């Protein structure tokens, strides 16, 4: 369903945010 | 559907936030 | 529809947050 | 409609958060 | 309506968060 | 109603987050 | 109700996040 | 119910975020 | 159900964010 798909896309967005935080961590580390 | 589309736009907003975090990481790195 | 429009406005809010993060990145860079 | 209005108020809250982030950026910049 | 009111209270919470960010900005500025 | 009450509790949680941010601001200021 | 309970658990999670922020504030201070 | 369970899992995710913040606090403290 | 599954995926996303914060903590100290 399309609503379920929208929720799954939101989840993917949150995972992208997590990756961004990991990049910040690498930036702090050096 | 329009509600599903709204959820998909929210997901895109989250992806933009992720990109902002990546830019912050680059800003720390230099 | 008005509920869908509300979701779309939320998405726009998230994009504004992303722009704020990009400004923070620029602030760190200089 | 009142639920739609609630969503629109949430969006306005997100925009205020974005402005807060922009103020942080200005604080970093000088 | 009570659900709408709940959403409006959430919006107010987000505005309080925005104010907290503005206070952080002032703290960075001096 | 109980769903409305749940939303109101979420709003209170957001207000607590705002207070946390205010404490961070005070920590930066001194 | 169980949906209401789910929302209340989310609220508790937000309060835990708030406490984490307060701990960060103490760490800065 | 499965929707309720999804909300409860989201709550657990937020608690994990809180633990991450506590780890950041420890990182600042040392 | 698929909506419930979507919520569960959101929860997993939040857990990934938590791990990112832990990585930031390690980066700080």
Author numbering:
A (entry chain D), B (entry chain C), C (entry chain B), D (entry chain A), E (entry chain I), F (entry chain H), ...: 1 to 30
G (entry chain G), I (entry chain E): 1 to 29
Quote from the publication:
Conversely, both Gly variants scored more favourably as larger oligomeric states: the a = d = Ile variant as an octamer; and a = Leu, d = Ile as a nonamer. The Gly@g peptide with a = Leu, d = Ile crystallized in two forms. Gratifyingly, one was an all-parallel nonamer, which is a new αHB with an exceptionally large channel of diameter ≈9.5–11.5 Å, Fig. 3. Attempts to model solvent into density observed in the channel were inconsistent. Therefore, representative solvent molecules were included where they matched the density; though these did not make any stabilizing contacts with protein. Although there are natural nonameric protein assemblies, this is the first stand-alone, water-soluble α-helical CC of this size. In addition, the crystallization conditions for the octamer and nonamer contained isopropanol. This increases the hydrophobicity of the bulk solvent, which potentially supports larger, hydrophobic pores that would otherwise be energetically unfavourable.
